Amino acid sequence: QCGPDPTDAYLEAASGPYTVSTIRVSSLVPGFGGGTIHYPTNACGGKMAGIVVIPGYLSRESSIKWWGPRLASHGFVVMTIDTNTIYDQPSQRRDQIEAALQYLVNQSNSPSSPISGMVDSSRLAAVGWSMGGGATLQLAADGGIKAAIALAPWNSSINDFNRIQVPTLIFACQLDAIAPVALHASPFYNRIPNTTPKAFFEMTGGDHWCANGGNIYSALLGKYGVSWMKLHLDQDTRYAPFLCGPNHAAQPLISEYRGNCPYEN
């Protein structure tokens, strides 16, 4: 689709090619707690996919805000959000992801928004951390987003994740003591139907915050995360060989990889 041919260095860089502007979204917005819209101002032309990023229990927008610039600078409209309260529960978080996505669609079709005309509503995704990652997987099981990324997800083991038909990438944090991989990210990944494109990247040594960015894992998180959205939202197959082919487990910072490559289409 749009932009430079990708390379490892280009995808591992702290910033993608585009300058990013931001809009503050007030907490008075209906259906979620406000946040920040990130959008590129010099991307090559058309409408873009829209992405919502949601934090976990007890946590604010600031905890996941790193994903906003990193995705937006590669040609996405990306809204990092607060929930209504930091104590919100899993199904409430799932409802708020959906309200936030609806907000991006509504503002793109508004006469008073800097992102008027910029969001393609057929190409929407969610990124979520912890309880917000469990809520992202729940939304994925409902079927109405086009891609999902879960960051150290936490969820009840009673779930519908064996119904997920949405391409899903899970980042697991090897030493997670809040959502231990063996009890959360790993069984969630396993249950996703094997007819659904999926990937599992476990980060060596990571605690529960490891997949939030702004740390030693940034280069790999950003490379795989942007490649996931480019491949599955934009259908940009130039990003497939960064996800399918490489010996991911040879990386010092990868302690386990799973996937069902090649992603056919």
PDB file of C-alpha atoms in Angstrom:
ATOM      1  CA  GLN A   1       0.000   0.000   0.000  1.00  0.00           C
ATOM      2  CA  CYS A   2       1.641   3.280   1.143  1.00  0.00           C
ATOM      3  CA  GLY A   3       5.169   4.371   2.053  1.00  0.00           C
ATOM      4  CA  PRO A   4       8.793   3.213   1.952  1.00  0.00           C
ATOM      5  CA  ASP A   5       9.820  -0.412   1.494  1.00  0.00           C
ATOM      6  CA  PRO A   6      10.441  -1.606   5.089  1.00  0.00           C
ATOM      7  CA  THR A   7      13.765  -2.818   6.527  1.00  0.00           C
ATOM      8  CA  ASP A   8      14.689  -4.114   9.976  1.00  0.00           C
ATOM      9  CA  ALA A   9      16.442  -0.869  10.915  1.00  0.00           C
ATOM     10  CA  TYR A  10      13.509   1.219   9.647  1.00  0.00           C
ATOM     11  CA  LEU A  11      10.992  -0.770  11.725  1.00  0.00           C
ATOM     12  CA  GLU A  12      13.225  -0.887  14.832  1.00  0.00           C
ATOM     13  CA  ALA A  13      13.812   2.907  14.851  1.00  0.00           C
ATOM     14  CA  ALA A  14      12.203   4.920  17.670  1.00  0.00           C
ATOM     15  CA  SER A  15      10.146   6.824  15.051  1.00  0.00           C
ATOM     16  CA  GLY A  16       8.537   5.901  11.754  1.00  0.00           C
ATOM     17  CA  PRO A  17       8.761   8.262   8.767  1.00  0.00           C
ATOM     18  CA  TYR A  18       5.829  10.620   9.479  1.00  0.00           C
ATOM     19  CA  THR A  19       5.487  13.658  11.707  1.00  0.00           C
ATOM     20  CA  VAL A  20       2.745  13.135  14.314  1.00  0.00           C
ATOM     21  CA  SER A  21       0.279  15.724  15.641  1.00  0.00           C
ATOM     22  CA  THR A  22      -1.985  15.187  18.636  1.00  0.00           C
ATOM     23  CA  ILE A  23      -5.418  16.282  19.887  1.00  0.00           C
ATOM     24  CA  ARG A  24      -6.448  16.157  23.525  1.00  0.00           C
ATOM     25  CA  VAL A  25      -9.815  14.351  23.956  1.00  0.00           C
ATOM     26  CA  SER A  26     -11.697  15.570  27.039  1.00  0.00           C
ATOM     27  CA  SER A  27     -12.943  13.146  29.669  1.00  0.00           C
ATOM     28  CA  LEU A  28     -16.445  14.490  28.999  1.00  0.00           C
ATOM     29  CA  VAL A  29     -16.460  12.460  25.786  1.00  0.00           C
ATOM     30  CA  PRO A  30     -19.251   9.861  26.056  1.00  0.00           C
ATOM     31  CA  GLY A  31     -18.423   6.213  26.677  1.00  0.00           C
ATOM     32  CA  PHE A  32     -14.759   6.370  27.806  1.00  0.00           C
ATOM     33  CA  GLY A  33     -12.468   8.610  29.815  1.00  0.00           C
ATOM     34  CA  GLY A  34     -10.806  10.727  27.126  1.00  0.00           C
ATOM     35  CA  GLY A  35      -7.224  10.465  25.964  1.00  0.00           C
ATOM     36  CA  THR A  36      -4.985  11.550  23.047  1.00  0.00           C
ATOM     37  CA  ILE A  37      -5.529  11.209  19.296  1.00  0.00           C
ATOM     38  CA  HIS A  38      -2.233  10.796  17.415  1.00  0.00           C
ATOM     39  CA  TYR A  39      -2.193  11.248  13.636  1.00  0.00           C
ATOM     40  CA  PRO A  40       0.447  11.756  10.935  1.00  0.00           C
ATOM     41  CA  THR A  41       0.443  15.017   9.022  1.00  0.00           C
ATOM     42  CA  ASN A  42       2.655  14.028   6.089  1.00  0.00           C
ATOM     43  CA  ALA A  43       1.582  10.471   5.350  1.00  0.00           C
ATOM     44  CA  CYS A  44       1.074   9.560   1.723  1.00  0.00           C
ATOM     45  CA  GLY A  45      -2.501  10.460   1.057  1.00  0.00           C
ATOM     46  CA  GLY A  46      -5.527   8.347   1.764  1.00  0.00           C
ATOM     47  CA  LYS A  47      -7.684   7.418   4.697  1.00  0.00           C
ATOM     48  CA  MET A  48      -5.875   5.325   7.340  1.00  0.00           C
ATOM     49  CA  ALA A  49      -6.735   2.529   9.756  1.00  0.00           C
ATOM     50  CA  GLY A  50      -7.810   3.643  13.260  1.00  0.00           C
ATOM     51  CA  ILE A  51      -6.422   2.073  16.469  1.00  0.00           C
ATOM     52  CA  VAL A  52      -7.411   2.399  20.146  1.00  0.00           C
ATOM     53  CA  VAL A  53      -4.884   1.618  22.939  1.00  0.00           C
ATOM     54  CA  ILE A  54      -6.243   0.875  26.442  1.00  0.00           C
ATOM     55  CA  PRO A  55      -4.426   0.425  29.815  1.00  0.00           C
ATOM     56  CA  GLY A  56      -5.021  -2.024  32.662  1.00  0.00           C
ATOM     57  CA  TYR A  57      -6.562  -2.006  36.104  1.00  0.00           C
ATOM     58  CA  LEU A  58      -5.404   0.871  38.369  1.00  0.00           C
ATOM     59  CA  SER A  59      -3.609   2.447  35.379  1.00  0.00           C
ATOM     60  CA  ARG A  60      -3.824   5.702  33.410  1.00  0.00           C
ATOM     61  CA  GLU A  61      -3.387   6.579  29.704  1.00  0.00           C
ATOM     62  CA  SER A  62       0.255   7.450  30.465  1.00  0.00           C
ATOM     63  CA  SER A  63       1.093   3.750  31.039  1.00  0.00           C
ATOM     64  CA  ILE A  64       0.479   2.813  27.357  1.00  0.00           C
ATOM     65  CA  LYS A  65       0.956   6.216  25.711  1.00  0.00           C
ATOM     66  CA  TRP A  66       4.217   5.111  24.014  1.00  0.00           C
ATOM     67  CA  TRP A  67       2.231   3.081  21.479  1.00  0.00           C
ATOM     68  CA  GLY A  68       0.490   6.248  20.216  1.00  0.00           C
ATOM     69  CA  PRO A  69       3.458   7.950  18.498  1.00  0.00           C
ATOM     70  CA  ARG A  70       5.089   4.692  17.521  1.00  0.00           C
ATOM     71  CA  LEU A  71       2.088   3.431  15.544  1.00  0.00           C
ATOM     72  CA  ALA A  72       0.961   6.869  14.274  1.00  0.00           C
ATOM     73  CA  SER A  73       4.404   7.689  12.821  1.00  0.00           C
ATOM     74  CA  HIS A  74       3.950   4.694  10.499  1.00  0.00           C
ATOM     75  CA  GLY A  75       0.617   5.928   9.088  1.00  0.00           C
ATOM     76  CA  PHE A  76      -2.236   5.146  11.524  1.00  0.00           C
ATOM     77  CA  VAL A  77      -4.743   7.247  13.462  1.00  0.00           C
ATOM     78  CA  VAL A  78      -4.169   6.099  17.056  1.00  0.00           C
ATOM     79  CA  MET A  79      -6.078   7.068  20.199  1.00  0.00           C
ATOM     80  CA  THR A  80      -4.558   6.256  23.593  1.00  0.00           C
ATOM     81  CA  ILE A  81      -7.311   6.422  26.225  1.00  0.00           C
ATOM     82  CA  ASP A  82      -8.191   6.619  29.885  1.00  0.00           C
ATOM     83  CA  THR A  83     -11.063   4.405  30.975  1.00  0.00           C
ATOM     84  CA  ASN A  84     -14.007   5.994  32.843  1.00  0.00           C
ATOM     85  CA  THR A  85     -12.317   5.075  36.155  1.00  0.00           C
ATOM     86  CA  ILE A  86      -9.091   3.249  36.931  1.00  0.00           C
ATOM     87  CA  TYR A  87     -11.150   0.557  38.687  1.00  0.00           C
ATOM     88  CA  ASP A  88     -13.160  -0.463  35.621  1.00  0.00           C
ATOM     89  CA  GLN A  89     -13.736  -4.211  35.146  1.00  0.00           C
ATOM     90  CA  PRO A  90     -13.106  -6.401  32.069  1.00  0.00           C
ATOM     91  CA  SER A  91     -16.438  -6.181  30.291  1.00  0.00           C
ATOM     92  CA  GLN A  92     -16.633  -2.450  30.986  1.00  0.00           C
ATOM     93  CA  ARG A  93     -13.178  -2.064  29.433  1.00  0.00           C
ATOM     94  CA  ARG A  94     -14.363  -3.975  26.345  1.00  0.00           C
ATOM     95  CA  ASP A  95     -17.399  -1.647  26.069  1.00  0.00           C
ATOM     96  CA  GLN A  96     -15.066   1.385  26.295  1.00  0.00           C
ATOM     97  CA  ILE A  97     -12.762   0.153  23.487  1.00  0.00           C
ATOM     98  CA  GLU A  98     -15.831  -0.102  21.285  1.00  0.00           C
ATOM     99  CA  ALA A  99     -17.075   3.393  22.288  1.00  0.00           C
ATOM    100  CA  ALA A 100     -13.606   4.835  21.617  1.00  0.00           C
ATOM    101  CA  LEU A 101     -13.499   3.235  18.126  1.00  0.00           C
ATOM    102  CA  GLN A 102     -16.999   4.566  17.414  1.00  0.00           C
ATOM    103  CA  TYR A 103     -15.720   7.980  18.501  1.00  0.00           C
ATOM    104  CA  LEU A 104     -12.900   7.872  15.914  1.00  0.00           C
ATOM    105  CA  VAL A 105     -15.386   6.950  13.155  1.00  0.00           C
ATOM    106  CA  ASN A 106     -17.793   9.682  14.272  1.00  0.00           C
ATOM    107  CA  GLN A 107     -15.069  12.361  14.433  1.00  0.00           C
ATOM    108  CA  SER A 108     -13.718  11.392  10.973  1.00  0.00           C
ATOM    109  CA  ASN A 109     -17.197  12.153   9.624  1.00  0.00           C
ATOM    110  CA  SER A 110     -17.505  15.430  11.599  1.00  0.00           C
ATOM    111  CA  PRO A 111     -17.091  19.017  10.250  1.00  0.00           C
ATOM    112  CA  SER A 112     -15.128  20.096  13.335  1.00  0.00           C
ATOM    113  CA  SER A 113     -12.296  17.647  13.779  1.00  0.00           C
ATOM    114  CA  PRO A 114      -8.632  17.782  12.733  1.00  0.00           C
ATOM    115  CA  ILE A 115      -9.003  14.110  11.710  1.00  0.00           C
ATOM    116  CA  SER A 116     -12.017  14.739   9.475  1.00  0.00           C
ATOM    117  CA  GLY A 117     -11.763  12.345   6.564  1.00  0.00           C
ATOM    118  CA  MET A 118      -8.771  10.444   7.937  1.00  0.00           C
ATOM    119  CA  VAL A 119     -10.197   7.192   9.365  1.00  0.00           C
ATOM    120  CA  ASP A 120     -11.214   4.181   7.256  1.00  0.00           C
ATOM    121  CA  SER A 121     -13.929   2.542   9.394  1.00  0.00           C
ATOM    122  CA  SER A 122     -13.439  -0.793   7.690  1.00  0.00           C
ATOM    123  CA  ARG A 123      -9.890  -0.995   9.226  1.00  0.00           C
ATOM    124  CA  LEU A 124     -10.104  -0.730  13.038  1.00  0.00           C
ATOM    125  CA  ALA A 125      -7.961  -2.409  15.685  1.00  0.00           C
ATOM    126  CA  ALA A 126      -7.431  -2.526  19.444  1.00  0.00           C
ATOM    127  CA  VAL A 127      -4.242  -2.723  21.533  1.00  0.00           C
ATOM    128  CA  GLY A 128      -4.625  -3.437  25.225  1.00  0.00           C
ATOM    129  CA  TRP A 129      -2.497  -4.029  28.338  1.00  0.00           C
ATOM    130  CA  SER A 130      -3.295  -6.335  31.265  1.00  0.00           C
ATOM    131  CA  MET A 131      -7.014  -6.290  32.030  1.00  0.00           C
ATOM    132  CA  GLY A 132      -7.273  -4.042  28.961  1.00  0.00           C
ATOM    133  CA  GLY A 133      -5.559  -6.826  26.986  1.00  0.00           C
ATOM    134  CA  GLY A 134      -8.142  -9.299  28.242  1.00  0.00           C
ATOM    135  CA  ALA A 135     -10.809  -6.820  27.139  1.00  0.00           C
ATOM    136  CA  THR A 136      -9.107  -6.500  23.702  1.00  0.00           C
ATOM    137  CA  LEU A 137      -9.237 -10.272  23.283  1.00  0.00           C
ATOM    138  CA  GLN A 138     -12.910 -10.226  24.320  1.00  0.00           C
ATOM    139  CA  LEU A 139     -13.640  -7.581  21.659  1.00  0.00           C
ATOM    140  CA  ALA A 140     -11.702  -9.714  19.160  1.00  0.00           C
ATOM    141  CA  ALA A 141     -13.938 -12.693  19.971  1.00  0.00           C
ATOM    142  CA  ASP A 142     -16.975 -10.467  19.144  1.00  0.00           C
ATOM    143  CA  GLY A 143     -15.652 -10.183  15.594  1.00  0.00           C
ATOM    144  CA  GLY A 144     -15.945  -6.504  14.700  1.00  0.00           C
ATOM    145  CA  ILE A 145     -12.284  -5.322  14.737  1.00  0.00           C
ATOM    146  CA  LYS A 146      -9.834  -6.251  11.988  1.00  0.00           C
ATOM    147  CA  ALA A 147      -6.718  -6.868  14.132  1.00  0.00           C
ATOM    148  CA  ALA A 148      -5.800  -7.094  17.804  1.00  0.00           C
ATOM    149  CA  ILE A 149      -2.614  -6.858  19.893  1.00  0.00           C
ATOM    150  CA  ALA A 150      -2.664  -7.942  23.559  1.00  0.00           C
ATOM    151  CA  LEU A 151       0.139  -6.604  25.835  1.00  0.00           C
ATOM    152  CA  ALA A 152       0.740  -8.977  28.800  1.00  0.00           C
ATOM    153  CA  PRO A 153      -3.005  -9.781  28.880  1.00  0.00           C
ATOM    154  CA  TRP A 154      -4.853 -10.688  32.104  1.00  0.00           C
ATOM    155  CA  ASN A 155      -8.255 -12.380  31.982  1.00  0.00           C
ATOM    156  CA  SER A 156     -10.410 -15.021  33.619  1.00  0.00           C
ATOM    157  CA  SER A 157      -9.711 -18.494  32.290  1.00  0.00           C
ATOM    158  CA  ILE A 158     -13.442 -18.625  31.554  1.00  0.00           C
ATOM    159  CA  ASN A 159     -13.528 -16.880  28.200  1.00  0.00           C
ATOM    160  CA  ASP A 160     -14.566 -17.109  24.553  1.00  0.00           C
ATOM    161  CA  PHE A 161     -11.096 -16.743  23.093  1.00  0.00           C
ATOM    162  CA  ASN A 162     -11.523 -20.070  21.268  1.00  0.00           C
ATOM    163  CA  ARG A 163     -13.925 -18.126  18.964  1.00  0.00           C
ATOM    164  CA  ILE A 164     -11.438 -15.428  17.776  1.00  0.00           C
ATOM    165  CA  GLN A 165     -11.410 -14.963  13.971  1.00  0.00           C
ATOM    166  CA  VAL A 166      -9.474 -11.648  14.084  1.00  0.00           C
ATOM    167  CA  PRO A 167      -5.672 -11.725  13.414  1.00  0.00           C
ATOM    168  CA  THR A 168      -4.229 -11.547  16.956  1.00  0.00           C
ATOM    169  CA  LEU A 169      -0.693 -10.913  18.208  1.00  0.00           C
ATOM    170  CA  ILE A 170       0.095 -11.516  21.885  1.00  0.00           C
ATOM    171  CA  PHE A 171       3.165 -10.049  23.608  1.00  0.00           C
ATOM    172  CA  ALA A 172       3.997 -12.065  26.746  1.00  0.00           C
ATOM    173  CA  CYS A 173       6.425 -10.928  29.447  1.00  0.00           C
ATOM    174  CA  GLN A 174       8.567 -13.920  30.523  1.00  0.00           C
ATOM    175  CA  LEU A 175       8.817 -13.022  34.257  1.00  0.00           C
ATOM    176  CA  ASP A 176       5.300 -11.556  34.628  1.00  0.00           C
ATOM    177  CA  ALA A 177       4.092 -11.987  38.206  1.00  0.00           C
ATOM    178  CA  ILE A 178       0.760 -10.178  37.817  1.00  0.00           C
ATOM    179  CA  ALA A 179      -0.526 -12.105  34.764  1.00  0.00           C
ATOM    180  CA  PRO A 180       1.851 -15.112  34.706  1.00  0.00           C
ATOM    181  CA  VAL A 181       2.388 -16.185  31.099  1.00  0.00           C
ATOM    182  CA  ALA A 182       1.561 -19.856  31.757  1.00  0.00           C
ATOM    183  CA  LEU A 183      -1.816 -18.894  33.241  1.00  0.00           C
ATOM    184  CA  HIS A 184      -2.791 -15.977  30.924  1.00  0.00           C
ATOM    185  CA  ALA A 185      -0.979 -15.074  27.636  1.00  0.00           C
ATOM    186  CA  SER A 186       0.027 -18.658  26.763  1.00  0.00           C
ATOM    187  CA  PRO A 187      -3.393 -20.381  27.146  1.00  0.00           C
ATOM    188  CA  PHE A 188      -5.129 -17.402  25.511  1.00  0.00           C
ATOM    189  CA  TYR A 189      -2.836 -17.718  22.479  1.00  0.00           C
ATOM    190  CA  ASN A 190      -3.279 -21.495  22.321  1.00  0.00           C
ATOM    191  CA  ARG A 191      -7.072 -21.290  22.303  1.00  0.00           C
ATOM    192  CA  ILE A 192      -7.337 -18.927  19.318  1.00  0.00           C
ATOM    193  CA  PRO A 193      -8.515 -21.065  16.362  1.00  0.00           C
ATOM    194  CA  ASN A 194      -5.553 -22.183  14.291  1.00  0.00           C
ATOM    195  CA  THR A 195      -7.367 -20.973  11.154  1.00  0.00           C
ATOM    196  CA  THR A 196      -6.857 -17.396  12.514  1.00  0.00           C
ATOM    197  CA  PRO A 197      -3.506 -15.711  11.828  1.00  0.00           C
ATOM    198  CA  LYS A 198      -1.810 -15.438  15.219  1.00  0.00           C
ATOM    199  CA  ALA A 199       1.600 -14.851  16.766  1.00  0.00           C
ATOM    200  CA  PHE A 200       3.118 -15.102  20.273  1.00  0.00           C
ATOM    201  CA  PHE A 201       6.315 -13.219  21.226  1.00  0.00           C
ATOM    202  CA  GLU A 202       7.595 -13.733  24.785  1.00  0.00           C
ATOM    203  CA  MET A 203      10.139 -11.115  25.896  1.00  0.00           C
ATOM    204  CA  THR A 204      13.169 -12.397  27.865  1.00  0.00           C
ATOM    205  CA  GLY A 205      13.114 -11.252  31.463  1.00  0.00           C
ATOM    206  CA  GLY A 206      10.068  -9.021  31.083  1.00  0.00           C
ATOM    207  CA  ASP A 207       7.896  -7.990  34.031  1.00  0.00           C
ATOM    208  CA  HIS A 208       4.172  -7.146  33.638  1.00  0.00           C
ATOM    209  CA  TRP A 209       5.078  -3.705  32.112  1.00  0.00           C
ATOM    210  CA  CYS A 210       7.446  -5.141  29.524  1.00  0.00           C
ATOM    211  CA  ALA A 211       5.172  -4.741  26.484  1.00  0.00           C
ATOM    212  CA  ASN A 212       4.231  -1.126  27.215  1.00  0.00           C
ATOM    213  CA  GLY A 213       7.271   0.253  25.376  1.00  0.00           C
ATOM    214  CA  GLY A 214       9.740   2.907  26.462  1.00  0.00           C
ATOM    215  CA  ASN A 215      12.249   0.242  27.515  1.00  0.00           C
ATOM    216  CA  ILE A 216      14.846  -2.169  26.182  1.00  0.00           C
ATOM    217  CA  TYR A 217      12.130  -4.138  24.312  1.00  0.00           C
ATOM    218  CA  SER A 218      10.995  -1.032  22.302  1.00  0.00           C
ATOM    219  CA  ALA A 219      12.751  -1.911  19.034  1.00  0.00           C
ATOM    220  CA  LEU A 220      11.215  -5.384  18.847  1.00  0.00           C
ATOM    221  CA  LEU A 221       7.768  -4.401  20.182  1.00  0.00           C
ATOM    222  CA  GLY A 222       7.558  -1.626  17.593  1.00  0.00           C
ATOM    223  CA  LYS A 223       8.843  -3.736  14.715  1.00  0.00           C
ATOM    224  CA  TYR A 224       6.445  -6.641  15.277  1.00  0.00           C
ATOM    225  CA  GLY A 225       3.507  -4.416  16.335  1.00  0.00           C
ATOM    226  CA  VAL A 226       3.692  -2.071  13.330  1.00  0.00           C
ATOM    227  CA  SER A 227       4.229  -5.088  11.031  1.00  0.00           C
ATOM    228  CA  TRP A 228       1.075  -6.717  12.473  1.00  0.00           C
ATOM    229  CA  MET A 229      -1.070  -3.641  11.770  1.00  0.00           C
ATOM    230  CA  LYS A 230       0.476  -3.022   8.314  1.00  0.00           C
ATOM    231  CA  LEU A 231      -0.092  -6.645   7.266  1.00  0.00           C
ATOM    232  CA  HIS A 232      -3.541  -7.174   8.685  1.00  0.00           C
ATOM    233  CA  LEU A 233      -5.090  -3.718   8.547  1.00  0.00           C
ATOM    234  CA  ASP A 234      -3.503  -2.297   5.372  1.00  0.00           C
ATOM    235  CA  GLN A 235      -2.963  -5.677   3.670  1.00  0.00           C
ATOM    236  CA  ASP A 236       0.586  -4.456   3.008  1.00  0.00           C
ATOM    237  CA  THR A 237       2.297  -7.755   2.300  1.00  0.00           C
ATOM    238  CA  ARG A 238       5.719  -6.075   2.338  1.00  0.00           C
ATOM    239  CA  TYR A 239       5.479  -6.477   6.151  1.00  0.00           C
ATOM    240  CA  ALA A 240       4.841 -10.243   6.101  1.00  0.00           C
ATOM    241  CA  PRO A 241       8.538 -11.322   5.999  1.00  0.00           C
ATOM    242  CA  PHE A 242       9.245  -9.507   9.278  1.00  0.00           C
ATOM    243  CA  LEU A 243       6.654 -11.767  10.949  1.00  0.00           C
ATOM    244  CA  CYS A 244       6.975 -14.989   8.909  1.00  0.00           C
ATOM    245  CA  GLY A 245      10.418 -16.381   8.027  1.00  0.00           C
ATOM    246  CA  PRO A 246      12.878 -14.987  10.567  1.00  0.00           C
ATOM    247  CA  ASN A 247      14.332 -17.081  13.392  1.00  0.00           C
ATOM    248  CA  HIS A 248      12.723 -14.880  16.059  1.00  0.00           C
ATOM    249  CA  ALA A 249      13.968 -17.069  18.919  1.00  0.00           C
ATOM    250  CA  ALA A 250      17.570 -16.328  18.017  1.00  0.00           C
ATOM    251  CA  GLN A 251      17.051 -12.793  19.342  1.00  0.00           C
ATOM    252  CA  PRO A 252      18.558 -12.236  22.846  1.00  0.00           C
ATOM    253  CA  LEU A 253      15.329 -10.563  23.982  1.00  0.00           C
ATOM    254  CA  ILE A 254      12.925 -13.255  22.654  1.00  0.00           C
ATOM    255  CA  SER A 255      12.511 -16.241  25.048  1.00  0.00           C
ATOM    256  CA  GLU A 256       9.714 -17.953  23.098  1.00  0.00           C
ATOM    257  CA  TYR A 257       7.995 -17.535  19.743  1.00  0.00           C
ATOM    258  CA  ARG A 258       4.860 -19.244  18.460  1.00  0.00           C
ATOM    259  CA  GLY A 259       2.866 -18.706  15.289  1.00  0.00           C
ATOM    260  CA  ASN A 260       0.967 -20.269  12.407  1.00  0.00           C
ATOM    261  CA  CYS A 261       2.804 -18.804   9.418  1.00  0.00           C
ATOM    262  CA  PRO A 262       2.349 -18.378   6.514  1.00  0.00           C
ATOM    263  CA  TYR A 263      -0.703 -16.071   6.780  1.00  0.00           C
ATOM    264  CA  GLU A 264      -2.461 -16.997   3.558  1.00  0.00           C
ATOM    265  CA  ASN A 265      -4.231 -14.444   1.300  1.00  0.00           C
TER     266      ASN A 265
END
